[PDB]
């Protein structure tokens, strides 16, 4: 509808796949080469389905901060025959608050879904499903099951992936440039 949705669509159309684990279908953001991210509660194993094709997992790393606190981001390297467009230059370098973000989801349940979520707070600590979690972004939208893995963008920036909600608010794990240096 406007330039926020423009940037979100440009990321969805080239940098997402549908990931299926034994815990469900997730929006999965591809970052560069064969490297993608997904919520850690997806419980990635040795094999994953990528757009319904059986795919070997070459590496999976559940990130934690240097306090040994959950970040709810798993970095996955896929045995895929095709690279993702490199989008690492759209990742923030530091923790921050944002205005006027969009949450974008693409699954079998919710194809081509875009939600203007508005202002994003650097929330910090969250007890997420009973797990102490850091680097949480919060937005005041009543987000639902089906949305986990959804991408949170502003114009020019890819800032997080949706990891939960409480019925009134939604919560994303931050993406930082420093997670994807090689």
UniProtKB/Swiss-Prot annotation:
It comes from Human enterovirus D68. Residues 2-180 form the Peptidase C3 domain. It comes from the Viruses. The active site is at residues 41, 72, 148. Interacts with host IFIH1/MDA5; this interaction inhibits host IFIH1. It is found in: Host cytoplasm. This is Protease 3C. It catalyses: Selective cleavage of Gln-|-Gly bond in the poliovirus polyprotein. In other picornavirus reactions Glu may be substituted for Gln, and Ser or Thr for Gly. Major viral protease that mediates proteolytic processing of the polyprotein. Cleaves host EIF5B, contributing to host translation shutoff. Also cleaves host PABPC1, contributing to host translation shutoff. Binds and inhibits host IFIH1/MDA5, thereby inhibiting the type-I IFN production and the establishment of the antiviral state. Cleaves host MAP3K7/TAK1, resulting in inhibition of TRAF6-triggered NF-kappa-B induction. Cleaves host TICAM1; this interaction allows the virus to disrupt host TLR3 signaling. Cleaves host IRF7, resulting in inhibition of type-I IFN production.
